[PDB]
C-alpha cells in the first residue's frame, strides 16, 4: 500500500514524498517501479510536450482489486463488472470513444419513452395473436424432439419437449457493440445469421436474453439488447468517475428491460420510432405477432422501391422483427415448457423468405449473395429433412399439398425429393387450368401456389423448370385477374388487424407476384383497378375514409407496382432463367425497356418492347397506335443479329375434327389498339385448344372476343418464334 | 499515414515514461492487447500519459517484457469499474479513485463523432467491417 506524489523536472529523476497508508511496500522498491510484487502500479503523467516540467503521480494498488467479488432463478443473465474477467481484447482494441461514441453525445437523449404497445403490469408479456396456441395434451407424452412418421402428423398439432433448453443450453459470454457496454453472460438457446453485400445481421438468443446486431453497408450499425427487467447495464463513457450512466433504452418493463446500442436515436432515424424498436420484444411472446408485422411492412417497401431502391428505416424495422420473433419462440418455449412442430418448421421458412426480401429490397444487395444460417438447440432441421426424405419415398387436396410443400421448402439444403417437385408441377398446372375459367383464388389456393413457386425457383433439368413455370405464372396474370389480385392485397391491408390476427404474404399471393410483366403499372390497367374497386363494397368504403381520391389513384398504383417489382424486377432470377435476353450488350434488358418476357424453348425467348428493338427477330403489330406500339421480338442466346419476320395467318380446325393436337405449346396474346396488353394465355392441352376453336362458346374469356370491345386483336405465338394470326 | 502495430517492447520502466507520444510521431495507430488469458496474472503496471494529443494508456508486463497500447478512455473506465465495486474497500483503493477522478480533466475530450457506415462483424473478429 503506497501512494506517491511526484514532481518531474528534467530528465534524471523526480522529487516526491511517500505516504504509505495502511500497509507495507518495499520503500526501496519505489526507486525502480515495482514489477516484483503481485501488485500493480498506476502512473498518471502530465508533461507538456513543449518540454515543460509538469508533474506525475503514482498509486500502487494490490491485485485482487481487479478481480470481481418458468423462472430466472436457475438460469440467470449476469452482467460483468469490467473487461478484466471477461473478454478483454475487444474492449482495448476498440476505437470507441476515440474516433466515435456508439452512443449519442448527449446523455439526456438516452432514456426513451416506452411505446403504448409495450407490456404493462396487467399484461406482463403482451398481446397474443387470436389463432391461439394449443394447450399440452393432458394424458399424452411430450416427445424429446419434433418428429413426423406420417402425413397426418403435419396437419394435426404435434408437440415436443422443451427439455433441450435445460440440458443442452450453452453458457457463453456476449460482447455488445464496440465495447459500448461491458460484457454480458447468458445461457444460449439459438443463433441466427443473415448475410448479404449491403448488410449482415447477427442474432444471439438465450434464456431471458437477445442480441441482434443490425448492420448495413449503406448505413449505421445498431445493436438491440434484451435482458430481464431486473438487470441493469453500465454504459462505457470517457468519464473516469465511479458513477453510472444507463445506455439508451426505455424504463424496464414488467418482464424484460430493453437496450438500444446505436446513434440513431435522434441524429439518424427518420422518426420518433426510435422508441418503437425498443418496444418490439415487450409487445409479444407470440412469434406470429412479430412475423406478421414483418410481413406487412415487407410488401409496403416493394411499392416504394421506385423512389428509393434502398429503404434504410425498413431494413432495421424488418430485421429487428425477425430477431425478436425467434427470441419470442425460444422464450415462449422455455416459459410454457412445450413446443409445436409447426412452430419450428415455420421459423425455417420465415428465415428464408423474409431474409430474401430483407437484403434484396431493403438493403439493396445483389440477390445472388443473399444467404442465411440458423442454429437452434430445440430444432434439428437436418434430421427433420431426413424424416421428410423417407416420407416422400414411401389426389391431394390443396390444404394437404400446402403443408407438404411448405415443410418441403422450409427444410432444404437445396436437395429436394423427386416426389416433392413432381407435386409442385401438379399444383401449378391445376391452379392454371382452373384460372382460365374463374377470376379469383381463395386463401387455400393462394398459399398453395406460393410454396409451389418457391420450391421450383429454389435451385438443363432444374433450369428448364424455372423457365416453363415463369410462363405459367405470367400467363395466369391477366389484366382481368390482376385487378382482382391487387384488390385482394388492398382489402387485406385495410381490414388487417396487427394485434389480433396474423398477416402473411402467401395469403395475399397471386400468379402476378410470380409473373414477368412490367406493364401492369400502365395507366390503362391502373384505371381499370379503380373502376373495379366498388366491386368489393366494404373495400371502397374504407379506402375513401382515409385517403384522398388522388391518394387512392396513387395507392392503387402502389399495389400494382408489386406484381412488376416482385419476380420481374429480380435481376438474379432473370439472369439465370433467361440469359438470352441479356446475352449481347443490351440496353432494353437493363433499362427495363422490355415490358414483358416469355421464355421459349432452349436458347430462345420472346419479348415485348415499346421502343426501337436493337436485337432479335422483330414482329411489329401495325394495328397499334404509333406512340404506344407493340413489338414481339424473338431473342436468341448466341444470335444477336437484328432482322424482321413475317406475320402469317392460319385457321383453327374443327374442335372435334382433329383429335390430334399440333397447337399445344403455343401462346395466345390478346391486346388492344391502345398499345395496352391484356391476356397472355398458353394453350396447355387439347381441352384448351378446343376451347379456342369456339368463339363465344368458350369458357375461357380471352378466347371469346364477344366479351371484349372492337379493339381486341389476337396473335398466336409459337415455340419456333413463328408469329401467326387467327382468322375469325 | 504512418501506422503502428500497437506494441513495442520495453525492458525498463524508466523508458516507458520517456517514450515520446505516439500521436505526435504517427497519424493513425492501432491498439493491441496482450496474448494472455488472465491480464491480472501477467500484468505489472499501468502508465497513463495525459497531455499527449490523444492521451495514451500503456499496459506493461515484466516477465514478458512488453508494453501494449490500449484504448485510453475505455481502459481507465474499465479499471475504475473493477476497483469501484461496493464490496471492495480499503484506503489503498480510496487513493486510486481520487487520483483517477480528474484524470482527463486537463486533457483533450473524447469523440463527439459518428462511426462510418458499413456492415459490422460480431466480436469474434472484433467488429470487423466485413459483410461476409
Amino acid at each position, epitope marked *: 500500500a503506497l501512494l506517491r506524489e511526484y514532481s518531474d523536472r528534467n530528465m534524471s529523476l523526480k522529487l516526491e514524498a511517500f505516504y504509505p497508508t495502511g500497509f507495507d511496500e518495499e520503500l526501496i522498491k519505489s526507486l525502480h517501479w515495482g514489477n516484483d510484487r503481485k501488485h500493480v502500479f498506476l502512473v498518471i503523467v502530465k508533461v507538456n510536450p513543449t518540454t515543460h516540467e509538469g508533474d506525475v503521480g503514482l498509486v500502487i494498488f494490490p491485485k485482487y482489486l481487479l478481480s470481481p467479488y418458468f423462472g430466472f432463478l436457475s438460469h440467470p443473465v449476469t452482467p460483468d463488472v469490467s473487461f478484466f474477467d471477461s473478454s478483454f481484447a475487444p474492449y482495448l482494441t476498440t476505437q470507441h470513444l476515440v474516433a466515435f461514441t456508439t452512443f449519442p453525445p448527449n446523455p439526456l437523449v438516452w432514456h426513451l419513452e416506452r411505446a403504448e404497445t409495450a407490456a404493462t403490469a396487467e399484461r406482463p408479456f403482451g398481446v397474443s395473436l387470436l389463432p391461439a396456441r394449443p394447450t399440452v395434451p393432458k394424458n399424452t407424452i411430450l416427445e424429446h424432439k419434433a418428429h413426423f412418421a406420417t402425413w397426418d402428423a403435419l396437419a394435426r398439432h404435434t408437440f415436443f419437449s422443451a427439455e433441450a433448453i435445460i440440458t443442452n443450453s450453452t453458457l457463453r459470454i456476449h460482447v455488445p457493440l464496440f465495447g459500448s457496454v461491458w460484457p454480458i453472460r447468458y445461457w444460449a438457446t439459438g443463433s441466427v445469421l443473415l448475410t448479404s453485400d449491403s448488410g449482415r445481421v447477427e442474432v444471439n438468443i438465450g434464456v431471458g436474453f437477445m442480441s441482434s446486431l443490425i448492420s448495413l453497408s449503406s448505413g449505421l450499425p445498431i445493436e438491440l439488447i434484451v435482458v430481464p427487467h431486473t438487470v441493469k447495464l453500465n454504459a462505457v463513457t470517457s468519464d473516469t468517475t*465511479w458513477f453510472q450512466l444507463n445506455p439508451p433504452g426505455p424504463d424496464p418493463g414488467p418482464s424484460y428491460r430493453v437496450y438500444l446500442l446505436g446513434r440513431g436515436l435522434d441524429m439518424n432515424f427518420s422518426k420518433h420510432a426510435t422508441v418503437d424498436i425498443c418496444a418490439y420484444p415487450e409487445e409479444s411472446l407470440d412469434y406470429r405477432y412479430h412475423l406478421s408485422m414483418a410481413h406487412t411492412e415487407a410488401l409496403r417497401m416493394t411499392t416504394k422501391a421506385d423512389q428509393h431502391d434502398i429503404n434504410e428505416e425498413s431494413y432495421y424495422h424488418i430485421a429487428a422483427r425477425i430477431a425478436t420473433s425467434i427470441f419470442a419462440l425460444s422464450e415462449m418455449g422455455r416459459t410454457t415448457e412445450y413446443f409445436l412442430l409447426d412452430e419450428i418448421v415455420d421459423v425455417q421458412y420465415q428465415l428464408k423468405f423474409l431474409n430474401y426480401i430483407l437484403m434484396r429490397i431493403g438493403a439493396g444487395a445483389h440477390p445472388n449473395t443473399i444467404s442465411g444460417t440458423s442454429d437452434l438447440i430445440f430444432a434439428d432441421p437436418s434430421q427433420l429433412h431426413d424424416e421428410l426424405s423417407l416420407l416422400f419415398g414411401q389426389f391431394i387436396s390443396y390444404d394437404e399439398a400446402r403443408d407438404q410443400l411448405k415443410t418441403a421448402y422450409a427444410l432444404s439444403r437445396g436437395q429436394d425429393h423427386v416426389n416433392a417437385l413432381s407435386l409442385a408441377r401438379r399444383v401449378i398446372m391445376s391452379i392454371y387450368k382452373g384460372l382460365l375459367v374463374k377470376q379469383n383464388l381463395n386463401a387455400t389456393e393462394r398459399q398453395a401456389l406460393f410454396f409451389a413457386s418457391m420450391i421450383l425457383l429454389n435451385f438443363s433439368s432444374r433450369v428448364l423448370d424455372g423457365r416453363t413455370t415463369l410462363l405459367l405464372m405470367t400467363s395466369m396474370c391477366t389484366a382481368a385477374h390482376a385487378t382482382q389480385a391487387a384488390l385482394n392485397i388492398q382489402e387485406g391491408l385495410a381490414y388487417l388487424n396487427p394485434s389480433k390476427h396474423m398477416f402473411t404474404i402467401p395469403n395475399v399471393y397471386s400468379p402476378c407476384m410470380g409473373s414477368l410483366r412490367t406493364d401492369l403499372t400502365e395507366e390503362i390497367h391502373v384505371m381499370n383497378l379503380l373502376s373495379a374497386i366498388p366491386t368489393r363494397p366494404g373495400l371502397n368504403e374504407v379506402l375513401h375514409t382515409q385517403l384522398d381520391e388522388s391518394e387512392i389513384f396513387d395507392a392503387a398504383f402502389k399495389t400494382m407496382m408489386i406484381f412488376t417489382t416482385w419476380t420481374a424486377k429480380d435481376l438474379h432470377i432473370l439472369h439465370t432463367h433467361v440469359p438470352e435476353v441479356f446475352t449481347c450488350q443490351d440496353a432494353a434488358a437493363r433499362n427495363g425497356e422490355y415490358v414483358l418476357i416469355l421464355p421459349a424453348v432452349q436458347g430462345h425467348s420472346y419479348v415485348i418492347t415499346r421502343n426501337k428493338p436493337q436485337r432479335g427477330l422483330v414482329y411489329s403489330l401495325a394495328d397499334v397506335d404509333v406512340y404506344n406500339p407493340i413489338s414481339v421480338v424473338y431473342l436468341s442466346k448466341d444470335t444477336c443479329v437484328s432482322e424482321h419476320g413475317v406475320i402469317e395467318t392460319v385457321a383453327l380446325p374443327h374442335p372435334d375434327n382433329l383429335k390430334e393436337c399440333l397447337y399445344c405449346g403455343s401462346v395466345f396474346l390478346r391486346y388492344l389498339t391502345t398499345g395496352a396488353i391484356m391476356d397472355i394465355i398458353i394453350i396447355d392441352s387439347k381441352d384448351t385448344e378446343r376451347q379456342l376453336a369456339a368463339m363465344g362458346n368458350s369458357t375461357i374469356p380471352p378466347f371469346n372476343p364477344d366479351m371484349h370491345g372492337d379493339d381486341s386483336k389476337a396473335v398466336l405465338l409459337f415455340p419456333n418464334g413463328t408469329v401467326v394470326t387467327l382468322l375469325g | 499515414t504512418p501506422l503502428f502495430f500497437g506494441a513495442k517492447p520495453l525492458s525498463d520502466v524508466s523508458l516507458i515514461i520517456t517514450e515520446p507520444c505516439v500521436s505526435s510521431v504517427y497519424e493513425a495507430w492501432d491498439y493491441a492487447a496482450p496474448p494472455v488469458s488472465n491480464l491480472s496474472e501477467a500484468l505489472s503496471g499501468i502508465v497513463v500519459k495525459t497531455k499527449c494529443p490523444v492521451p495514451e494508456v500503456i499496459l506493461w508486463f515484466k516477465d514478458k517484457q512488453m508494453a501494449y497500447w490500449t484504448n485510453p478512455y475505455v481502459t481507465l473506465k474499465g479499471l475504475t469499474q473493477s476497483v469501484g465495486e461496493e464490496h471492495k474497500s480499503g484506503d489503498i483503493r480510496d487513493a486510486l479513485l481520487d487520483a483517477l477522478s480528474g484524470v482527463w480533466v486537463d486533457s483533450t475530450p473524447s469523440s463527439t463523432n459518428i462511426p462510418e457506415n458499413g456492415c459490422v462483424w460480431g466480436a469474434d473478429r472484433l467488429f470487423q467491417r466485413v459483410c461476409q
Partner: antibody, heavy 121, light 108 residues
Framework: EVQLVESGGGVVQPGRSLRLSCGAS????????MHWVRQAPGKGVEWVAV????????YYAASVKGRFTISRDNSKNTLFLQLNTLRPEDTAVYYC??????????????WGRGTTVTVSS | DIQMTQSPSSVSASVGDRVTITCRAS??????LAWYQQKPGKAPKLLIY???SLQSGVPSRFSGSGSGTDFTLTISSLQPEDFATYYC?????????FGGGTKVEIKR
C-alpha cells in the same frame, strides 16, 4: 412530494466530533447518491461530499479530506456525517441533498431543511 | 480544482425586465451547469440542471444557454417573488465546484 429532515447540530468545543444524520421522506434511499453541502454565514455555497448508491465509494471535497467521515445505509435511510477533528473554520450551516439522477451532471433536485453547527463554550 | 466566476455580482431591476446572470469557469468545460435559488433564511432550490433544461415547481419563465466557456441564465419576465441570491454549479468536471453567487434585489 419528497422531503428530507436533518437531525444534528448544537455547539461543540474545538477539536471534537459530531454526527449529523438525515431522514428521507417518500424517497427510496437505495436509488440515488446523496450530497452534503455546506454554507457558512454570510458566505456562499460549497459542496462537501457524495455517497454512492448504498454503502460505497464516497467522493470527498478538497478542504476536509482528512477530517471527514461519511457513511450511509439503505435500512433506516440514515446518511450520517462525522467530523472527527477540524475545529475552527467548520462553523457553518450544513445541508443534505440528493443528486437528480445518479450522475453528477444534473446536480441536486432534492433538498433538506437544515442544521446549524457552531463552535464555542 | 475549478474556480467559478459569476457576473455581474449584483443586479437590481424592475418587475418584468429581462435579467441576465452568466457564470464563468477556469476550465473549458463542455455543457452542464446547475442553477440554484436561495432566498434569505430559506434552503436552496434547483432551477435549471443543464442550460435550457428547467423542470421543477419553479415557473417556466426562466431559461438559459451557452456552450464551452460561459453559460447564461435569463429571466424572461421578472417577478417580485424572484428576490434571492443566485449560485451556479459546474458539474462537467468533478473535484468540486460552485459559483460565487449573485444577489438580485428587486427595484423601483
Amino acid at each position: 412530494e419528497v422531503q428530507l429532515v436533518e437531525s444534528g447540530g448544537g455547539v461543540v468545543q474545538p477539536g471534537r466530533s459530531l454526527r449529523l444524520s438525515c431522514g428521507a421522506s417518500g424517497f427510496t434511499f437505495n436509488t440515488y447518491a446523496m450530497h452534503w453541502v455546506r454554507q457558512a454565514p454570510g458566505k456562499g455555497v460549497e459542496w462537501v461530499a457524495v455517497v454512492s448508491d448504498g454503502g460505497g465509494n464516497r467522493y470527498y471535497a478538497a478542504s476536509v479530506k482528512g477530517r471527514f467521515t461519511i457513511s450511509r445505509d439503505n435500512s433506516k435511510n440514515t446518511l450520517f456525517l462525522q467530523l472527527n477533528t477540524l475545529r475552527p473554520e467548520d462553523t457553518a450551516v450544513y445541508y443534505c441533498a440528493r443528486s437528480r439522477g445518479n450522475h453528477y451532471y444534473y446536480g441536486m433536485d432534492v433538498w433538506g431543511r437544515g442544521t446549524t453547527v457552531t463552535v464555542s463554550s | 480544482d475549478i474556480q467559478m466566476t459569476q457576473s455581474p455580482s449584483s443586479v437590481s431591476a424592475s418587475v418584468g425586465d429581462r435579467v441576465t446572470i452568466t457564470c464563468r469557469a477556469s476550465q473549458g468545460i463542455s455543457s452542464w451547469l446547475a442553477w440554484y435559488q436561495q432566498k434569505p433564511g430559506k434552503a436552496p432550490k434547483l432551477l435549471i440542471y443543464a442550460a435550457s433544461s428547467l423542470q421543477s415547481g419553479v415557473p417556466s419563465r426562466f431559461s438559459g444557454s451557452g456552450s464551452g466557456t460561459d453559460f447564461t441564465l435569463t429571466i424572461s419576465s421578472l417577478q417580485p417573488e424572484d428576490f434571492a441570491t443566485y449560485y451556479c454549479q459546474q458539474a462537467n468536471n468533478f473535484p468540486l465546484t460552485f459559483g460565487g453567487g449573485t444577489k438580485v434585489e428587486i427595484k423601483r
